Design an enzyme around this catalytic site. Structure first.
Site, PDB file in Angstrom:
ATOM      1  N   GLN A 146      -8.632  -6.754 -91.392  1.00 27.86           N
ATOM      2  CA  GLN A 146      -8.242  -6.248 -90.056  1.00 27.86           C
ATOM      3  C   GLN A 146      -7.381  -7.213 -89.321  1.00 27.86           C
ATOM      4  OE1 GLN A 146     -12.602  -4.238 -89.154  1.00 27.86           O
ATOM      5  NE2 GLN A 146     -11.159  -4.261 -87.398  1.00 27.86           N
ATOM      6  N   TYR A 332     -50.951 -34.902 -95.033  1.00 26.87           N
ATOM      7  CA  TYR A 332     -51.574 -33.989 -96.024  1.00 26.87           C
ATOM      8  C   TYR A 332     -50.572 -33.839 -97.204  1.00 26.87           C
ATOM      9  CZ  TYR A 332     -55.497 -32.068 -93.233  1.00 26.87           C
ATOM     10  OH  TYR A 332     -56.705 -31.838 -92.567  1.00 26.87           O
ATOM     11  N   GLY A 444     -62.097 -26.262 -93.539  1.00 26.41           N
ATOM     12  CA  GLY A 444     -61.664 -25.018 -94.219  1.00 26.41           C
ATOM     13  C   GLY A 444     -61.003 -25.250 -95.489  1.00 26.41           C
ATOM     14  N   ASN A 480     -54.108 -22.576 -96.123  1.00 24.89           N
ATOM     15  CA  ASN A 480     -54.607 -23.973 -96.046  1.00 24.89           C
ATOM     16  C   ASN A 480     -53.732 -24.940 -96.738  1.00 24.89           C
ATOM     17  OD1 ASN A 480     -57.563 -22.178 -96.428  1.00 24.89           O
ATOM     18  ND2 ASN A 480     -57.065 -23.249 -94.535  1.00 24.89           N
TER      19      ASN A 480
HETATM   20  C1  F43 Z   1     -13.497  -2.487 -93.866  1.00 28.28           C
HETATM   21  C2  F43 Z   1     -14.009  -1.788 -92.545  1.00 28.28           C
HETATM   22  C3  F43 Z   1     -15.065  -0.772 -92.954  1.00 28.28           C
HETATM   23  C4  F43 Z   1     -16.370  -1.565 -92.749  1.00 28.28           C
HETATM   24  O1  F43 Z   1     -17.446  -1.282 -93.261  1.00 28.28           O
HETATM   25  N1  F43 Z   1     -16.126  -2.534 -91.843  1.00 28.28           N
HETATM   26  C5  F43 Z   1     -14.705  -2.787 -91.600  1.00 28.28           C
HETATM   27  C6  F43 Z   1     -14.319  -4.217 -91.713  1.00 28.28           C
HETATM   28  C7  F43 Z   1     -15.308  -5.086 -90.962  1.00 28.28           C
HETATM   29  C8  F43 Z   1     -15.092  -6.624 -91.003  1.00 28.28           C
HETATM   30  C9  F43 Z   1     -13.590  -7.011 -90.912  1.00 28.28           C
HETATM   31  C10 F43 Z   1     -13.276  -8.526 -91.277  1.00 28.28           C
HETATM   32  C11 F43 Z   1     -12.098  -8.599 -92.215  1.00 28.28           C
HETATM   33  O2  F43 Z   1     -11.002  -8.160 -91.849  1.00 28.28           O
HETATM   34  O3  F43 Z   1     -12.303  -9.191 -93.298  1.00 28.28           O
HETATM   35  C12 F43 Z   1     -15.967  -7.157 -89.851  1.00 28.28           C
HETATM   36  C13 F43 Z   1     -15.450  -8.384 -89.095  1.00 28.28           C
HETATM   37  C14 F43 Z   1     -17.473  -7.375 -90.300  1.00 28.28           C
HETATM   38  C15 F43 Z   1     -17.629  -8.578 -91.210  1.00 28.28           C
HETATM   39  N2  F43 Z   1     -17.741  -8.256 -92.488  1.00 28.28           N
HETATM   40  O4  F43 Z   1     -17.585  -9.685 -90.785  1.00 28.28           O
HETATM   41  C16 F43 Z   1     -15.869  -5.894 -88.977  1.00 28.28           C
HETATM   42  N3  F43 Z   1     -15.364  -4.836 -89.462  1.00 28.28           N
HETATM   43 NI1  F43 Z   1     -14.549  -3.275 -88.391  1.00 28.28          NI
HETATM   44  N4  F43 Z   1     -14.491  -4.419 -86.653  1.00 28.28           N
HETATM   45  C17 F43 Z   1     -13.987  -4.121 -85.496  1.00 28.28           C
HETATM   46  C18 F43 Z   1     -13.467  -2.868 -85.115  1.00 28.28           C
HETATM   47  C19 F43 Z   1     -13.120  -1.892 -85.994  1.00 28.28           C
HETATM   48  C20 F43 Z   1     -12.158  -0.737 -85.683  1.00 28.28           C
HETATM   49  C21 F43 Z   1     -10.742  -1.324 -85.501  1.00 28.28           C
HETATM   50  C22 F43 Z   1      -9.783  -0.196 -84.949  1.00 28.28           C
HETATM   51  C23 F43 Z   1      -8.408  -0.798 -84.708  1.00 28.28           C
HETATM   52  O5  F43 Z   1      -7.517   0.025 -84.308  1.00 28.28           O
HETATM   53  O6  F43 Z   1      -8.119  -2.004 -84.830  1.00 28.28           O
HETATM   54  C24 F43 Z   1     -12.302   0.157 -86.903  1.00 28.28           C
HETATM   55  C25 F43 Z   1     -13.205   1.351 -86.675  1.00 28.28           C
HETATM   56  C26 F43 Z   1     -12.515   2.329 -85.736  1.00 28.28           C
HETATM   57  O7  F43 Z   1     -11.418   2.801 -86.159  1.00 28.28           O
HETATM   58  O8  F43 Z   1     -13.057   2.664 -84.631  1.00 28.28           O
HETATM   59  C27 F43 Z   1     -12.917  -0.803 -87.935  1.00 28.28           C
HETATM   60  C28 F43 Z   1     -12.853  -0.512 -89.264  1.00 28.28           C
HETATM   61  C29 F43 Z   1     -13.436  -1.331 -90.328  1.00 28.28           C
HETATM   62  N5  F43 Z   1     -14.322  -2.252 -90.255  1.00 28.28           N
HETATM   63  C30 F43 Z   1     -12.882  -1.109 -91.710  1.00 28.28           C
HETATM   64  C31 F43 Z   1     -11.503  -1.765 -91.910  1.00 28.28           C
HETATM   65  C32 F43 Z   1     -10.432  -1.170 -90.943  1.00 28.28           C
HETATM   66  C33 F43 Z   1      -9.009  -1.530 -91.428  1.00 28.28           C
HETATM   67  O9  F43 Z   1      -8.794  -1.193 -92.645  1.00 28.28           O
HETATM   68  O10 F43 Z   1      -8.244  -2.045 -90.702  1.00 28.28           O
HETATM   69  N6  F43 Z   1     -13.485  -1.933 -87.332  1.00 28.28           N
HETATM   70  C34 F43 Z   1     -13.289  -2.659 -83.654  1.00 28.28           C
HETATM   71  O11 F43 Z   1     -13.034  -1.541 -83.152  1.00 28.28           O
HETATM   72  C35 F43 Z   1     -13.290  -3.847 -82.700  1.00 28.28           C
HETATM   73  C36 F43 Z   1     -14.249  -4.971 -83.074  1.00 28.28           C
HETATM   74  C37 F43 Z   1     -14.006  -5.308 -84.573  1.00 28.28           C
HETATM   75  C38 F43 Z   1     -15.033  -6.248 -85.231  1.00 28.28           C
HETATM   76  C39 F43 Z   1     -14.759  -7.723 -85.028  1.00 28.28           C
HETATM   77  C40 F43 Z   1     -15.135  -8.268 -83.650  1.00 28.28           C
HETATM   78  O12 F43 Z   1     -16.031  -7.646 -83.016  1.00 28.28           O
HETATM   79  O13 F43 Z   1     -14.573  -9.293 -83.235  1.00 28.28           O
HETATM   80  C41 F43 Z   1     -14.888  -5.818 -86.689  1.00 28.28           C
HETATM   81  C42 F43 Z   1     -16.259  -5.954 -87.487  1.00 28.28           C
HETATM   82  O1  LIG Z   2     -14.972   1.400 -90.323  1.00 28.16           O
HETATM   83  S1  LIG Z   2     -16.380   1.417 -89.900  1.00 28.16           S
HETATM   84  O2  LIG Z   2     -16.641   2.305 -88.806  1.00 28.16           O
HETATM   85  O3  LIG Z   2     -17.194   1.812 -91.132  1.00 28.16           O
HETATM   86  C1  LIG Z   2     -16.883  -0.168 -89.494  1.00 28.16           C
HETATM   87  C2  LIG Z   2     -16.417  -0.662 -88.137  1.00 28.16           C
HETATM   88  S2  LIG Z   2     -16.725  -2.356 -87.861  1.00 28.16           S
HETATM   89  O1  LIG Z   3     -61.353 -30.578 -88.373  1.00 30.41           O
HETATM   90  S1  LIG Z   3     -60.788 -29.434 -89.139  1.00 30.41           S
HETATM   91  O2  LIG Z   3     -61.247 -29.338 -90.468  1.00 30.41           O
HETATM   92  O3  LIG Z   3     -61.183 -28.258 -88.353  1.00 30.41           O
HETATM   93  C1  LIG Z   3     -59.081 -29.514 -89.152  1.00 30.41           C
HETATM   94  C2  LIG Z   3     -58.568 -30.612 -90.049  1.00 30.41           C
HETATM   95  S2  LIG Z   3     -56.780 -30.864 -89.727  1.00 30.41           S
END
Ligand code: F43
Ligand SMILES: O=S(=O)(O)CCS
Ligand SMILES: O=S(=O)(O)CCS
Ligand SMILES: C[C@@H](OP(=O)(O)O)[C@H](NC(=O)CCCCCCS)C(=O)O
Ligand SMILES: [Mg+2]
Ligand SMILES: [Mg+2]
Ligand SMILES: [Mg+2]
Ligand SMILES: [Mg+2]
Ligand SMILES: [Mg+2]
Ligand SMILES: [Mg+2]
Ligand SMILES: [Mg+2]
Ligand SMILES: [Zn+2]
Lengths: 548, 246, 442, 548, 110
Positions: A146, A332, A444, A480
């Protein structure tokens, strides 16, 4: 030759160790001690700074009406006051625990199958090496996909990384050695053979998350942290969509289907997640200790390095803090790793067995238990009766019980090659010691001891288990001091006499064969001494982000 | 079916995307080969990889539900499940994230649609995904300046447009050419360079974006002035609240 | 009868079985077949005699990758299965003619065990099944071979694993559909901690039967949790009947009408039309070219919408023959139907919310996995009170082989043993027969 | 006056905050950032020293194709890159959690009853002071009874102590004031009278164990360590036998019968013991935050200080590390405590409610929820539409959803004086937002959101709870970012509008009114900024015991 | 009446509800018993004690022969009393969650 504890006794006391009488009350209390004097002065400075009274030598009873002794850390020539062995004051002991807590073993075998089958992509040494460069950027807390990510400071998290191992030498030798725990380099040939045959063509990651995160959080953080960054590095290195249905199979595999935790979670009265000390079985603790791969010509040294690892972790940090706290349980535990006392007793027993039976050649039966555990018990107890300075050194009956029965249980297992008759010899030692001196441990101490004989060989639901599978959550053992680390030694003893590469889990054994750990698991007692001397450098500190 | 309440152009456009009887306007022609290249899952002339054997080779027990439900063609064949993912600018792209998942599950069979703020995805059997993808790319689901085909690194839905009117893309998969005014796809959806670029046509002008957009905004049609659509949202809130109580 | 509702019941081929059955004849509290299913799943254990023998021969006991060198024991357990099983049965039963069952399968490699019901009527919970079975087989194996006192603790480790050091039976070679009481997310959840893949394996991937078994377990848990007490009881019974028992052939007929070319959206349109035709909903208000629907029976609207949701899963994931999109069906069926009608979706938004997190935790790095590893006790999928997980069971029944963590991978021991049991395998049949039998007692 | 976020937006971008267009791709990637440049250099240094690649800016995708923004910490004039707000890089954020984890409240009511009734001894202010001198020696890990004890170094455990409080002024003033949390000094008059009335004649200890121990161990250590040293100090100060039957009543009282943990233990899928973040209910988190006793004239400030407390702890440390890990969730949380954005929206809603209803004067019903949450939702959303720089700043939909709905739910609770209708307003906000922009949060953001409306007023077993009693283990809330800290703000909002001294537990409120804490709970956002600047000094470091 | 719900020393100012539950114990108990029972005249027992201050409740044994374990006893009992209290006084949607907290505590956060 002198018993192995004579040098320490001669360092401790002015009298020769056989002398029966002494003088007390003339040492000026705490003023005899460099460390207590340090503490009194620090207490006054703390109390002024913060405006609340704190350490004060005049509260309560006056320490040091007898000699406040130095302790020799066994196998070293380091002598320290016992406060330098308290885990709070010893950064080596704290790091030993952090290095276990922040480790998890995570297969790549399901993961590579998901890649080949669901995604229809190839896996090769090349793609593995790409993946490993990727995960070694990501694991300490840095981004790969990201935009606008904010990351961990690399120098705060310099102890976190990912290595791999495999029994397939073709793949192992081809990856950058930077990422590989090389079984052939780390283990002597016999043991490497055994370990590679156990692992086979499996490929396993050893993941270490940052110490600063493990300290801020808990053991149950480790496998989650590991899986998030494995997951990101699978997406980046194999060109998945960044979050598609197959991404969930990588998560399920890294968090559950091919994870090996160091400890399993605990029941609610002592509620704790994974990778806490109580969940670490005794067989794993013996395998984490790396004495087996260095000191394999000396089964006593391997077994007692395991006892030291376990006594410190299980008694000082686990029972003496997680499960209690305060001043806690330093001595101990130190009775099992100082003054060469357990070493004297256990080398006697090894000698006894080697001459009478030959190691591992005694019948695995009660006859052998009765012979070896009684003989070694009477040897250890006779030393306290012949050396009054040794009895005043290991002054608490629990200490003596653990030490004498560790030597008896380990020697029994050196005879039988089987940990379960080792454990029966531990309990018989306790019953003989209790009758000889008309005392045993603390109030104990022998809960487990009196249940002990009957539960060694039981098969019932919450009673029956081979010793190697037992741990601090085995019901009788859950409370213990003065048992758990010695049981890890008994678990190691028959395997060290047999020359086995591991006690219970070969993956755990290999996963600590790694000089990029902060603590050196090959020489646990040497590390405890280095920490006691204030010479060990732990990870996890915040100095880089705090003022000068 | 009614699909959506409201009396704005936005509301009608949300209904038209859902309604399989509404003919999506086609805006651009893309070859089958170029859809395959933009998806990036297989190479030109590569046979569809399989995840399991063809259904006819499987000899399954009697199941009245399976007997009633016709499998899509890629399911009959045992094709991998693959995806296509789009990012839509909040500056008046024609489709938007929930508009897409709602529309996809009314128009397409055998579909796993996911909605997020910055990306929206469909996963289905690979040969069927290539047919749907042609329609998602050629029609008013897509604008080549304000919508992006992006399997990773999706940031930009909420960013300021550049001076060409193009959404941000960390990996610059779609390039506007200053001298010619057309966008070309220069990388596939995961960011790998294409041997030859794919022309995606001209960005829709402002007027046409406003005609076709499904986002409500103060500088377009505000949601708070589509009082009938707000009434139904509020109704849902209140009915779920009362029903969870008693 | 507390409720006046009646339903028509059908078999899994869409043929009528019994008309005008009172709703409470399907209640877990009244229906004897649901009682026998639930007491069966409490008391039934799968024993892997081959796995015990292999763990002993290699000393691989105590969990993944664990081994104790020097502890190997080579015992001919499978070749003496008949004797071992009979001796275990003598310790398992209470009396000689009770309902204990011990039956060898696979040439003696496996055993189906049903611990006698009566042990449970004097027990707090259900752990007597694995614990009585485990010790009877540990003792029978020790007594078959005269295993010594020094070695017998290895037999215990091969049967029940690292327990009690571990909380679970970690490395055990027995299996149950239930999991240990400590793993419940809340009190009353035990019938919810049953992997979807175990339900699909027990019912041999028959879609209707998988959906019925899952529903029966989920809605029976709703009673144990107190959710189906008082104000909510009728809502739960109608969900059981219409979403899991194909009441009035509603699910079946939706799938028939939409199976050839249908989508989630076509199934919605048909369900809305059927609810209107049946008087379950009516137009309340006209907005601008938009009819706002209302109902004077929210439990029945919820049930009809729940039947539609099951049909939509069958149509959608049936057309793909791929289970993953069940998380999307569970979401957008409910999101589309609320904007189509002005009425609340199934379980008043809680299926939709379960589906949002289930979609995330089946397509992301953070946890979850494929559909078949969820269950009603899983943190991701516990939130809807019975109306989500049976759709996941139907979807995994229809999956043609897209899952790594499929029922073949996770549930093979369960499948061999638990599909032997007629009432587990074909519960739709037995629950409908029992409802027709007690029809005049309600 | 300008909207409160305008200065931050002018600091971040060269364009005016209203400008719809910009330029990208011209900033040199990571090279635009001081902090990424520091990280690239540190990664080279870490990898070269340890012999394993680590941070590498060329792994995966190239950060900084757009501006990598500074953030203003709200209510401050400190602007930092977001990496300085990552909990790993911010010692104030780590110490905030240590100070909660290592605290436990422990009554003396049952204890003093045991002394009077069972031992037959008198308790007075004098015997209480003598017990407090004794327990402030023993609590950090020093001895009071046995000979030959080895103890913690007082300077490593300088942050551990015990204080007491009581609602009886005359009794409080008779105990040595070094040990007393003085309610009248710490709280304005009206809140002080409320708190003293809650406590009455009850006497309670606030026990803080050492940060170095809490970091070594876990939260479930805190009440045990507390009770060990209470037990020793009751032995020493009231002259018990050192271990008699009555000793066990002080153990049961301090460990169970009169302990108040900060957090309750968690179920097994997320197994954790007590005093971990997931167990801390939202009403306790609002009470831990001390903004209520300083900023009581401004209920917006109090509420949004609690939001900052909770967004950091619950999203950054708990959900972003204990429950996941890696790069984690910094900006999911910073959206709620930076750039004065949530403040601008929440002041708008507070003034809207003042003008239409009067604080706490609206009917507590769905009419009020529909009016206030809808109006405040649209205001927030219009700001992102009017200001393209604001939308590019809070670029993730989840961040916007949490910020807009926190302002809507806190404003609804300012109108009704009841947190439950505040929570209904939060969910209605999400439903309007979703329809307005055809998006909301991340894939899984609105699981609780869609269950939300129906579960606000449910009364069923695992559904129905007043918001103050919910927390990170409420089933629907157990997974997702962008909710828990905002819910703690909504739980605070009606109580700050009413002028209530506490939200859910008066003992917890008093227990953090203490300048002997290391973190200053009265100014959470100020402390976060101090830590971001690397100017916070945490406890727990090992410098004294490691090489110079 | 005091809003002291959710565990030791806990209180929510402003949430107090003054309901005459002991004065109306018989009606509340009867309404709970009707929800607790499976059938009329089965083995369900609801008996008041201490002039309506306490109730002995025995949930019908049949609910346990279709349950995995024993939590139906507190769960079925708590919900029947929460609903019978709410129905006795016509407690509003806005306030009913305090009845729940006063019956069953901080569950499910704890
Ligand atoms: C791989 C995933 C799927 C998953 O399971 N988690 C990911 C990735 C993961 C990684 C990204 C770190 C890296 O880049 O290596 C971390 C930091 C978690 C970690 N493993 O430490 C994270 N997201 Ni995600 N993730 C975020 C977010 C988001 C937003 C980003 C939207 C945009 O337009 O930029 C979208 C979800 C959405 O569309 O609503 C999102 C997706 C995704 N999130 C897509 C990757 C998106 C991409 O391909 O760019 N995160 C956020 O919306 C903001 C906070 C942000 C988190 C980091 C922080 O809080 O500082 C991060 C939280
Ligand atoms: O892309 S996902 O919504 O699965 C994860 C956001 S941090
Ligand atoms: O005196 S007691 O056996 O109760 C505890 C030892 S550390
Ligand atoms: C779901 C569950 O994961 P499992 O399915 O059990 O692997 C759970 N994680 C989470 O809830 C992740 C929460 C934080 C990461 C996502 C925030 S939106 C846990 O690890 O116990
Ligand atoms: Mg090489
Ligand atoms: Mg080294
Ligand atoms: Mg070293
Ligand atoms: Mg064409
Ligand atoms: Mg009309
Ligand atoms: Mg207006
Ligand atoms: Mg200060
Ligand atoms: Zn810790």
């Amino acid at each position: 030759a002198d018993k192995l504890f004579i040098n320490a006794l001669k360092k401790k006391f002015e009298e020769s160790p056989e002398e029966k009488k002494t003088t007390f009350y003339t040492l000026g209390g705490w003023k005899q001690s460099e460390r207590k004097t340090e503490f009194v002065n620090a207490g006054k400075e703390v109390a002024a700074k913060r405006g609340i009274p704190q350490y004060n030598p005049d509260i309560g009873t006056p320490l040091g009406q007898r000699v406040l002794m130095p302790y020799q850390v066994s196998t070293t020539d380091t002598y320290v006051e016992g406060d330098d062995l308290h885990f709070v004051n010893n950064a080596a002991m704290q790091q030993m625990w952090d290095d276990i807590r922040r480790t998890v073993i995570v297969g790549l075998n399901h993961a590579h199958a998901v890649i080949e089958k669901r995604l229809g992509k190839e896996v090769t040494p090349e793609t593995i090496t790409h993946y490993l460069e990727t995960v070694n950027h990501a694991m300490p807390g840095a981004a790969v996909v990201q935009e606008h990510m904010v990351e961990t400071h690399p120098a705060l998290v310099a102890d976190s990384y990912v290595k791999v191992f495999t029994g397939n030498d073709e793949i192992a030798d081809e990856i950058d050695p930077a990422f590989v725990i090389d079984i052939n380099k780390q283990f002597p040939e016999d043991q490497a053979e055994t370990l590679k045959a156990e692992v086979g063509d499996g490929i396993w990651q050893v993941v270490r998350i940052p110490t600063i995160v493990s300290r801020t959080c808990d053991g149950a953080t480790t496998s989650r942290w590991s899986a998030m960054q494995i997951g990101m590095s699978m997406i980046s290195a194999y060109k998945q969509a960044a979050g598609e249905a197959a991404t969930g199979d990588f998560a399920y595999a890294a968090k559950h289907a091919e994870v090996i935790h160091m400890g399993t979670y605990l029941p609610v009265r002592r509620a704790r997640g994974e990778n806490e000390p109580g969940g670490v079985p005794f067989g794993y603790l013996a395998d984490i200790c790396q004495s087996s791969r260095v000191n394999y010509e000396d089964p006593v040294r391997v077994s007692l390095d395991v006892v030291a690892t376990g006594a410190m972790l299980y008694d000082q940090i686990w029972l003496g803090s997680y499960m209690s706290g305060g001043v806690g349980f330093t001595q101990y535990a130190t009775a099992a790793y100082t003054d060469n006392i357990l070493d004297d007793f256990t080398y006697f027993g090894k000698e006894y067995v080697e001459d009478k039976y030959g190691l591992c050649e005694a019948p695995n039966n009660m006859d052998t238990v009765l012979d070896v555990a009684t003989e070694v018990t009477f040897y250890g107890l006779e030393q306290y009766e012949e050396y009054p300075a040794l009895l005043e050194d290991q002054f608490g009956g629990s200490q003596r019980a653990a030490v004498v029965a560790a030597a008896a249980g380990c020697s029994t297992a050196f005879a039988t090659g089987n940990a379960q008759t080792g454990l029966s010899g531990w309990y018989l030692s306790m019953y003989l010691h209790k009758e000889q001196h008309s005392r045993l441990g603390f109030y104990g101490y022998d809960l487990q001891d009196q249940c002990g004989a009957s539960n060694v060989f039981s098969i019932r639901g919450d009673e029956g288990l081979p010793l190697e599978l037992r741990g601090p959550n085995y019901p009788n053992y859950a409370m213990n001091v003065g048992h758990q680390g010695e049981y890890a030694g008994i678990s190691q003893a028959p395997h060290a006499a047999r020359g086995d590469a591991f006690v219970f889990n070969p993956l755990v054994k290999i996963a600590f064969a790694d000089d990029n750990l902060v603590f050196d698991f090959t020489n646990v007692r040497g590390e405890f001494a280095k920490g006691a001397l204030r010479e060990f450098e732990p990870a996890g500190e915040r100095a880089l982000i705090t003022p000068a | 079916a009614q699909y959506y309440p409201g009396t704005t152009k936005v509301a009608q456009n949300r209904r038209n995307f859902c309604n399989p009887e509404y003919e999506l306007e086609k805006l651009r022609e893309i070859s089958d080969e170029d859809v395959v290249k933009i998806l990036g899952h297989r190479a030109p002339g590569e046979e569809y990889p399989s995840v399991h054997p063809p259904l006819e080779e499987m000899d399954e027990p009697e199941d009245a539900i399976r007997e009633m439900v016709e499998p899509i063609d890629g399911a009959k064949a045992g094709d991998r499940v693959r995806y296509i993912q789009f990012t839509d600018s909040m500056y008046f792209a024609p489709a938007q994230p929930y508009v897409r998942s709602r529309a996809y599950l009314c128009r397409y069979r055998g579909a796993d649609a996911g909605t997020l703020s910055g990306r929206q995805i469909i996963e289905t059997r690979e040969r069927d995904l290539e047919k749907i993808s042609k329609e998602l790319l050629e029609t008013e689901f897509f604008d080549p300046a304000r919508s992006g085909v992006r399997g990773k690194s999706v940031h930009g839905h909420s960013l300021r447009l550049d001076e060409d009117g193009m959404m941000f893309d960390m990996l610059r998969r779609q390039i506007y050419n200053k001298d010619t005014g057309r966008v070309e796809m220069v990388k596939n959806q995961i960011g790998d360079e294409l041997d030859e670029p794919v022309d995606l046509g001209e960005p829709l002008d402002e007027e046409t974006l406003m005609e076709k957009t499904t986002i409500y905004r103060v500088d377009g049609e505000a949601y708070r002035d589509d009082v009938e659509a707000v009434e139904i949202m509020q109704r849902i809130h209140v009915l779920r609240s009362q029903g969870g109580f008693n | 009868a507390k409720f006046e509702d009646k339903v028509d019941l059908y078999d899994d081929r869409g043929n009528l079985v019994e008309e005008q059955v009172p709703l409470e004849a399907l209640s877990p509290l009244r229906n004897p077949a649901i009682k026998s299913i639930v007491q069966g799943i409490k008391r039934t254990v799968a024993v892997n005699l081959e796995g015990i023998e292999n763990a002993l021969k290699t000393a691989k006991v105590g969990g993944p990758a664990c081994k104790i060198m020097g502890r190997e024991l080579d015992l001919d357990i499978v070749g003496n299965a008949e004797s071992i099983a009979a001796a275990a049965k003598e310790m398992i039963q209470v009396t000689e003619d009770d309902d204990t069952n011990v039956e060898l399968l696979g040439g003696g490699k496996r055993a189906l065990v049903q611990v006698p019901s009566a042990r449970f009527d004097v027990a707090a919970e259900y752990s007597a099944a694995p614990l009585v079975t485990a010790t009877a087989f540990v003792q029978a194996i020790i007594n078959e071979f005269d295993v010594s006192m020094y070695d017998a603790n290895m037999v215990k480790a091969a049967v029940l694993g690292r327990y009690p050091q571990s909380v679970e039976y970690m490395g055990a070679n027995i299996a149950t559909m239930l999991d240990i009481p400590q793993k419940l997310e809340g009190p009353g959840y035990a019938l919810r901690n049953i992997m979807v893949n175990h339900v699909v394996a027990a019912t041999l991937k028959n879609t209707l039967q998988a959906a019925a078994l899952s529903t029966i377990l989920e809605q029976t848990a709703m009673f144990e949790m107190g959710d189906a007490v008082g104000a909510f009881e009728r809502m739960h019974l109608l969900g059981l009947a219409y979403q899991g028992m194909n009441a009035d052939n509603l699910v079946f007929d939706l799938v028939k009408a939409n199976g050839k070319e249908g989508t989630v959206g076509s199934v919605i349109a048909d369900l809305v039309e059927r609810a209107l035709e049946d008087g379950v909903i009516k137009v309340e208000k006209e907005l601008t070219d938009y009819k706002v629907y209302g109902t004077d029976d929210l439990a029945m609207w919820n049930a009809y919408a729940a039947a539609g949701l099951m049909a939509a899963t069958m149509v959608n994931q049936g057309a793909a023959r791929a289970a993953q999109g069940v998380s999307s069906t569970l979401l957008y069926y409910n999101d589309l139907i609320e904007f189509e009608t002005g009425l609340p979706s199934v379980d008043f938004g809680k299926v939709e919310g379960t589906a949002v997190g289930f979609s995330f935790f089946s397509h992301s790095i953070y946890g979850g996995g494929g559909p078949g590893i969820f269950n009603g006790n899983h943190i991701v999928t516990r939130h809807s009170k019975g109306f989500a997980i049976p759709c996941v069971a139907a979807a995994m029944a229809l999956d043609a082989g897209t899952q790594m963590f499929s029922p073949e991978a996770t549930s093979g021991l369960i499948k061999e043993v638990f599909s032997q049991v007629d009432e587990f395998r074909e519960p739709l049949k037995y629950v409908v027969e029992a409802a027709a039998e007690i029809k005049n007692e309600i």
